[PDB]
Design an enzyme around this catalytic site. Structure first.
Site: not given
Lengths: 180, 178, 178, 178, 178, 178, 180, 180, 180, 180, 180
Positions: C55, C84-85, C109, C158
């Site tokens: 996001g 990620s978020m 990441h 990643d």
């Protein structure tokens, strides 16, 4: 037109993205020029923002295969496959204009290759092979260890004409020939 | 909405449906329903009816962990078709309450995916594929009792099972007749 | 709407979901829910279940500040995938109540973005990128206990973690089994 | 609708959100909410939470005049990002109750627009641009206490502020910690 | 729907909004609201808030006649922007209760339209344009007190007014401050 | 839905609207409303407000027969624009209760249509056009009191009437002032 | 057609947006004309609303490289890359028609370059390099300090033919040659 | 084809919307014709519904620049840029057919120019400059004060061939030459 | 191809919708044919479903202007602008085939012209002017009073070849020349 | 190509849907062939699935008008306008191959003609006229009463080559000329 | 162009996806070259990412049918149908460049063939037949048992030039002929 005249002077102009069709045209031109005169040099002008790896190796082998020396001159920019092809010219005849830009980076995909995990294991293996071969080819022509190139090409590495000389991609930077 | 009216009445009876491709929307709705049902009464069973063409693995794992960790037993039913994550979630029900209906079809196949990035990113994506493949096969082996070697061999290409064949294989415990 | 019926029943139990890509719609809905739950009872915990592909960073910061400033403790659960978020907000829960479920995946990441303007505007956009990168890594370091140098190195490409690896790394405090 | 359920419960607590690009739909909804809240109780505060990428100036002026003329004090909170009209409306809250959250971002930039007509119409459009530019900068100067000359210089290109920098600059009065 | 909830609560307080381009949908909804409010209580005022980029003339005439013939006084407020039919309907409120908010913008311009048919049909369309132009200018003159000659000259091209200039011109009776 | 809330409240007051191009959806909704209102109380009037750009003739005939056969008187009001089937239905109200509002526009024009089939089918379609044309003009003559010859001549091309001209012509009985 | 006749008179018509393909054609024409006659002048007519920077430097180096003097005449307008190329002509032979318009401004992108922040650090660095190089090139050919140009090109700066002369982009404004 | 024959007779046919590409073609034709014979006249036929201002001034300067007189004949219509170019022909040789229509109006945009207010201040200033230059050019060639033209061109002003003569855009209206 | 041969026989084939580009081609052909032989006749074959008015008057004036007589033959149909151009041929040489169809009607628009009411007043005035001019032109060539034509062209009026003769649009209906 | 050779043998190949552009090409070919040799026959090969009526009558009159006899040979199929044109050939020289298919049917529209009822009265009248003319033309060339044709063409009536002979559309069915 | 020159040297360039149209062109070239000189060799250059099976067998039979020996040289890559055609060259004259890539895999569909189950039984039977025939053909030309090939081609099997030699697809890997 200008391109037919350049061809009559044994000049190939690699001015497009090196797609498969583009590689076919370049290889046809190299083969014809070798047939016409195996001893006289061929000059390839390079100005291209990119290209694919498979097309790269097609052109690369045709360039090494033909009897005639190939002089490579970078105008504008030589990016990714154009950069390898610039390095792949005949030693002592790889040249670039003063503000020529050379961009080397690991090969990449666009879009998505889809399939079963077992198919993608194979595709990923082939892509790693292509990266290894790109780096090995540049090592052969630049004198840098393939490991150094593997690290350098991790991210877009942009070289100026002078840096391309120091880095082993070209033999000399062209001086301007203006009479005045 | 009539469809929702029917489904909500059944939710009050501890019946929940997995009726489409497993994606994040379905997985989140279904996990919420399992959490809610377990909260209302953790002693009673939940009956999960599965009819699905397949789905995403991450979403399926959300569903699967919610099923495993729910304090209540979860029974599973194969109606229509239980394909790949429908099959996984079917076999993932509590042992002894995994049902197939007589004319159900159960489809087992190796994961699908895709490769998008630079050679470096692709090396990473391929490594993660290898890990996922092994884990999915390990869990299928735990569910069915088959050796993991057999799961890997059988799932190479689309392997269709009838309800009877699924019972012999070990996806389900019972086939419902009446 | 059945989906909303289930979610609202769970909201009354102080359970809220982050079920999609974090954008401004999700961030605003979720911030409103946290504010509302804290207003109703500031002593009881809120349980945030995270299943998200990623996001926007600004939206994620809205969520994160609302979580931090809420007078109540917020517990976080990683189900499916926390990318990620999702990973940031997972690790952003109160220390001691950050949970992973056994087959969850946590993906770390470096930020993504893009460059659009004139050379001057691009210089500005790049400067702001540098600032954002440093701040996101600093907060991950505070969450996990890892040196910021390690966060920057690991997040280069990643970096996938299993629930066990996430526990050792420091994204979560516990892995739920039952 | 669950989103609306949450927002309406909060509306009853005199909490309203500006959660998207300010356009006429948002401005009219938000003006209606401010009018309604002030009508219900003109002595109690309204808490406006701002998380917005930007928006139209005319719509923003509708919001701003409704805020100013409401008989009740309006507090403002910067969560996520307050960009250009989010920033304006943030700084437009009553002085002493303009808050930033610790990881908020506040973006100030000169207005955007476009030119469409014949040379005569374009002369008119350009004149109106000049007027708008001066008025927006004048109001920012009144809000922050900075000289209008500084607002014009700083807003030339995207000028990002952290919550701390926004506090020193004068967009907000306090940064909320807890 | 939250937006409708807010608007309906305000409708019960005899507050109605014109929040978009005036077309037949808006004109019919708004005429219905005025008829309904006047039916409920014909002695109390109706407060019409105008924020509109423009609109169709026929739809605007529906609104205008409904306003004029309603047995109750109708007050008008210019918030945000009142452009061309927003301006007309603003100036069309009962004299003595036409308000501008301090940072409102009021835009007056001659009508727009188009020509589509055969030379004969186009002669007819042009004649009807001439009639409409004269009538719209006549009504603006009645509203503001300006000579019709001045309305025609000023409206030749986009003529922007600030709230103060609109007060001097005669579009509004008061500017609200507080 | 707020629009529907307003319209339904007015339906309870025996006020119904024709607010768009007459097609089968509008005609069926409006016929249902007239049937329903007449069923609830056949002695009280129905007030039909017309604001319409035109519409289909078959749908308009459904409306017209429902109006004529309803046991209750139906009053009609021209607000905004009553064009072609709006005009027909306006003039079709019970004589003595057909109203125009002061700034209404009433547009009379000959029917539109199209030709699609083989030469044989086209001969048929043209014959049916001739029949429709004559019937529509006959009914306009019955409504207004004008000779059918005059209706045919006047409706040759777009014939615009002001409310005053419509009163003299015979479309309406009264113009409402207040 | 008219363009082939102009070419036979050693005239290049830079009448298009200077894309990569356009730069390839221009460079091919310059190379061919140098080959045909290294001593006789080349005239390049400039009328173009814009172009990219990479294409700009490609053409720029080819123009400086060839032996023949290049006369540059601005018709209509010379915008951004056409403006630099106008300045880049042989000193004393850079000319413009009386109502010719010259537009100089910093280089810019269109669309969006997307990637990881680490990729965009590199792309932003390269774009700043391109701005620096544009400004340095104009300084070399106009006599203004690169700092002054850096400030001037911040916003679209439009010069009339006379201003282009005073500003150092052209050497003279052409007089009309009408016989009557 | 007919157009190549017309060119061989020193005839340019301005039959298209005067876009940038169109202006390039017209200027190339004028330059070639001047080279072929500087003394013999060039005739330009004008039939065009419109064109841009930048292209207008490009063609205008090329028309004034070439040594050969340019005769301008309006067929059909000369609208906005074609109208200015009609006025811009050599005095005494600007002609139109009896039912020729001449349309003069202020320059305008299509679409939208977007940007920061500071960019649009500049763009609006340039557009006002273009209007001023259009009106000044017409004043130079028609004999009407630029203020009168500025008022006249506020709205589409359509002139008949006879009115175009009285208004100073053409020198004479052509008589039909039919032998019978 | 057949059309180049017809041109070599001084034959213009007006076989397309008379758009602006089409009018340009027709006028170029008429001008070239007059140049080649001012005394020998030009034959124009007409088969077209329609066209615009501005293009109509362009072609009309070129047809009246050239020295050579123009014979006009209607094949298939001559609709609206083709019909006026058929009437506009040289008297005594306007002809049509037996089943030729001639369609005359007032000029019309397609799409929508949008603008301020003040712009549309002007556009409507110009369209009424175009109708008046069409009707006046037909009156000049048919012998019917312009008022009669104004009434007749209110709705699509379709004339057979014989009616076109009686109505003054053509001078004679062609007899078939089949030898057997 | 094959078609130019066929033309040199005075052969027209009506191999396309008879649109307006197609009718223009056919009429141009007929006119050119008559000019080249008025006495020698023209052969038209017909293989087409359809066409419009207005184009039909255009070609029909050109076929009857030219001095040379026209031989018509149906290959494949002759549908609706191709069928009328097949019947319209010179008597005694209308021929078809054994499996040739002839399809005759009333004219029809596609899409929709929209307008006021008063416009559609006229359009419907014209379409009925076109049907009457089609049927009358076929009666003239087949010997069947126009009333019989009017009934027969109500629905798609498909004739075999032999039936087309018995029905009066062709004079004979071609025998195969294979030497073996 | 280069390809016509290559053809004059009896060189076919198989540079495209082997679609049906592509197969037609290749077969036409082979037939023409055999006609011109049945004894002199034909060289086919192969660089293609794929192709269909039906087109594959078309080209394959034409290659075996013609009297002249066919030399096959793999440039770039020979994938799926290009790979079979590479194997299908004359023994002793099948060659590849050092970095040439050869990709062999079972035939596959794209899109979907839809129908009744009874139609899809037939289509599936035909596709299995095509797989069997592909594998049998490769066995005939490589010396590997068809069963081994059937297993190998289950998944994309990528061979290097050297592996293609060891695997029996080519006879030798070309050495570079560069004179220096």
């Amino acid at each position: 037109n200008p391109y037919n005249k350049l061809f009559e002077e044994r000049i190939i102009f690699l001015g497009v993205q090196v797609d498969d069709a583009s590689a076919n045209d370049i290889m046809a031109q190299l083969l014809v020029l070798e047939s016409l005169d195996p001893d006289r040099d061929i000059t390839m002008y390079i100005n291209s923002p990119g290209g694919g790896f498979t097309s790269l190796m097609a052109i690369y082998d045709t360039m090494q295969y033909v009897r005639a020396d190939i002089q490579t001159v970078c105008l504008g920019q030589a990016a990714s496959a154009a950069a390898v092809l610039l390095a792949a010219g005949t030693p002592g005849k790889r040249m670039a204009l003063p503000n020529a830009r050379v961009l080397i980076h690991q090969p990449s995909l666009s879009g998505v290759i889809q399939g079963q995990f077992s198919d993608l294991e194979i595709q990923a293996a082939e892509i790693e092979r292509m990266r290894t071969l790109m780096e090995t080819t540049l090592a052969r022509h630049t004198g840098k260890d393939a490991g150094v190139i593997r690290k350098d090409t991790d991210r877009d590495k942009i070289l100026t004409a002078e840096e391309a000389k120091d880095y082993g991609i070209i033999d000399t930077v062209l001086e301007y020939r203006k009479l005045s | 909405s009539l469809t929702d009216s029917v489904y909500e009445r059944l939710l009050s009876e501890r019946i929940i449906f997995l009726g489409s491709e497993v994606n994040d929307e379905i997985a989140n709705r279904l996990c919420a329903q399992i959490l809610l049902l377990a909260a209302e009464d953790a002693s009673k069973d939940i009956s999960l009816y599965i009819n699905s063409p397949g789905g995403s693995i991450s979403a399926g794992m959300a569903i699967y962990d919610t099923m495993v960790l729910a304090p209540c037993d979860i029974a599973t039913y194969a109606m229509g078709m239980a394909a790949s994550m429908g099959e996984f979630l079917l076999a993932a029900g509590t042992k002894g309450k995994r049902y197939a209906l007589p004319h159900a079809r159960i489809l087992m196949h190796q994961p699908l995916g895709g490769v998008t990035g630079s050679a470096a990113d692709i090396a990473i994506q391929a490594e993660q594929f290898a890990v996922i493949k092994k884990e999915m096969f390990r869990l299928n082996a735990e569910f069915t009792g088959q050796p993991i070697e057999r799961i890997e061999a059988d799932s190479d290409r689309d392997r269709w099972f009838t309800a009877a064949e699924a019972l012999e294989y070990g996806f389900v415990d019972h086939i419902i007749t009446r």
